[PDB]
Amino acid sequence: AVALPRVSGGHDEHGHLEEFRTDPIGLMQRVRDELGDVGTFQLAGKQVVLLSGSHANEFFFRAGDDDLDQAKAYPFMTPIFGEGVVFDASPERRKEMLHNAALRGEQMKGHAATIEDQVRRMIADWGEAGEIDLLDFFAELTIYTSSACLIGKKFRDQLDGRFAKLYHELERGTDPLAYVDPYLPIESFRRRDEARNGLVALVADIMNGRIANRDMLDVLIAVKAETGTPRFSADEITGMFISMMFAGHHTSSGTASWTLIELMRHRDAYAAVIDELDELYGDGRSVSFHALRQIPQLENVLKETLRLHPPLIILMRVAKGEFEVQGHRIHEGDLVAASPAISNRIPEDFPDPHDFVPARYEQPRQEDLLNRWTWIPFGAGRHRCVGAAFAIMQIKAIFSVLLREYEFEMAQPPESYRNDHSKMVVQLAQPAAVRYRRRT
Ligand code: HEM
Numbered sequence: 003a004v005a006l007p008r009v010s011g012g013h014d015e016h017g018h019l020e021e022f023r024t025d026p027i028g029l030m031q032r033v034r035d036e037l038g039d040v041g042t043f044q045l046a047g048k049q050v051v052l053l054s055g056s057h058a059n060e061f062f063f064r065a066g067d068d069d070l071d072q073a074k075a076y077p078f079m080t081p082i083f084g085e086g087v088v089f090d091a092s093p094e095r096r097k098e099m100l101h102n103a104a105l106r107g108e109q110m111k112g113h114a115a116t117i118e119d120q121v122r123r124m125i126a127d128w129g130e131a132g133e134i135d136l137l138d139f140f141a142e143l144t145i146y147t148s149s150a151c152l153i154g155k156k157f158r159d160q161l162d163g164r165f166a167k168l169y170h171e172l173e174r175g176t177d178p179l180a181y182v183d184p185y186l187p188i189e190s191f192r193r194r195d196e197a198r199n200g201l202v203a204l205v206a207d208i209m210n211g212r213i214a215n216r217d218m219l220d221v222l223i224a225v226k227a228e229t230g231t232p233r234f235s236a237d238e239i240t241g242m243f244i245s246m247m248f249a250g251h252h253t254s255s256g257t258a259s260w261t262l263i264e265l266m267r268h269r270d271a272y273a274a275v276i277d278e279l280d281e282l283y284g285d286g287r288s289v290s291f292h293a294l295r296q297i298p299q300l301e302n303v304l305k306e307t308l309r310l311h312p313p314l315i316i317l318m319r320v321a322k323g324e325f326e327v328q329g330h331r332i333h334e335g336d337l338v339a340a341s342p343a344i345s346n347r348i349p350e351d352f353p354d355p356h357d358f359v360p361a362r363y364e365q366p367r368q369e370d371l372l373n374r375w376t377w378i379p380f381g382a383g384r385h386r387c388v389g390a391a392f393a394i395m396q397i398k399a400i401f402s403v404l405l406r407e408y409e410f411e412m413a414q415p416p417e418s419y420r421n422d423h424s425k426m427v428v429q430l431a432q433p434a435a436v437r438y439r440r441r442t
């Protein structure tokens with residue numbers, strides 16, 4: 003019956019939702035600044051209990067779904083999974099099935115080689131010098147890396163830029179209004195639905211083309227119902243493929259962009275990384291060898307990039323019961339959140355938190371490992387990212403190629419590179435123009 007502390011503002015139609023669209027990080031920081039480790043904001047009808055700091059975060063992260071349910075806490079995903087089911091099982095098991103085969107350790111070497119090949123294909127027409135836009139380049143690249151590694155090379159070879167453009171529109175269909183209802187009649191939700199239909203059509207075209215001529219798609223095409231009719235539709239297959247690719251796409255795209263941006267903004271780190279790559283690859287071993295092993299300067303740059311630019315800025319649960327955190331009572335049904343954007347910059351935990359300091363992660367310091375509940379770009383505890391090893395290998399593979407072949411410079415002011423945080427799926431804003439030139 004007692005209400006939790008509530009952050010200032012929130013006087014718009016849907017409470018704090020309008021501000022959560024326009025400046026979610028400022029809102030979440032204001033919750034912490036005004037209220038401390040436990041505070042709330044209103045997302046339309048829903049109260050969000052935002053936790054921060056090590057103690058409250060530990061509660062959040064160590065909770066299992068019996069206490070804090072993650073399954074229903076990201077409703078923007080519902081229209082993405084859609085209605086089709088290919089492999090019928092419990093929600094939890096269907097989730098395992100999306101990723102686990104491809105994430106097996108024994109598959110990593112092959113993925114690193116695949117990723118290398120995709121990067122070389124993407125830069126094949128670059129020539130001596132030119133300009134790219136980071137969102138256009140990395141969003142497309144990571145469609146190819148994600149499809150080739152998760153679904154198969156044969157399938158990726160039938161994809162082109164159209165798939166990437168449509169997938170982007172799908173990701174843009176994640177407005178926080180989805181906590182109201184992900185099927186509301188707003189333009190971005192409409193464009194999401196149209197884009198999903200376009201992706202189904204691309205897959206149908208691929209399926210039809212193959213009939214007239216044994217990757218995962220071949221297997222699924224061949225499955226017959228009792229009468230001989232094919233068991234699976236293009237919609238069912240497409241829904242599964244879209245869902246298999248989703249977690250790794252926006253995160254790899256953004257993380258690659260921000261890793262390159264931070265390298266360009268910090269040319270001392272960039273120089274150190276180049277030297278390290280040149281020396282390491284001087285043993286003559288392939289990217290499929292090195293991307294699975296230590297590349298310390300690059301890895302520390304990546305860790306610091308993830309600290310400053312975590313691709314998921316808020317993590318969500320639905321409380322399944324009542325809990326007390328620092329004397330504040332969370333009630334059944336409450337949305338409960340933790341924020342990597344805020345936690346990753348707590349000044350007690352990360353000295354000079356707004357500064358890019360890859361040395362934070364060197365062996366004597368290890369600020370990532372020390373701050374178990376507040377260095378959280380991959381989450382922590384029960385639901386810690388199962389894709390982290392893959393994601394880190396992929397950055398190492400991508401930059402092993404890019405940084406040895408080309409030199410990069412910012413074509414716009416360094417301060418002008420920024421994210422669009424208006425959707426639950428964060429994307430780099432445009433323009434993000436960058437010059438390249440072949441290394442001599
Ligand atoms: C830099 C890249 C990535 C980042 C920053 C990232 C971030 C995160 C975060 C913050 C969580 C915790 C979510 C929560 O607590 O609710 C998480 C969990 C998860 N991630 Fe990622 N992720 C990345 C790459 C990937 C990839 C490549 C995959 C699959 C190929 C993936 C699949 C998953 C899955 C399945 C979970 C849930 C694990 C569980 O519930 O036990 N992630 N990730």
Ligand SMILES: Cc1ccc(S(=O)(=O)NCCCOC(=O)Nc2ccncc2)cc1
Nearest residue numbers: 072076079097100245248249250253387427
């Ligand atoms: C397909 C899928 C992927 C991740 C999950 S989850 O249990 O982590 N729930 C979060 C759903 C929204 O995730 C999301 O929007 N992005 C994401 C990227 C990388 N890792 C995790 C999440 C659930 C389903």
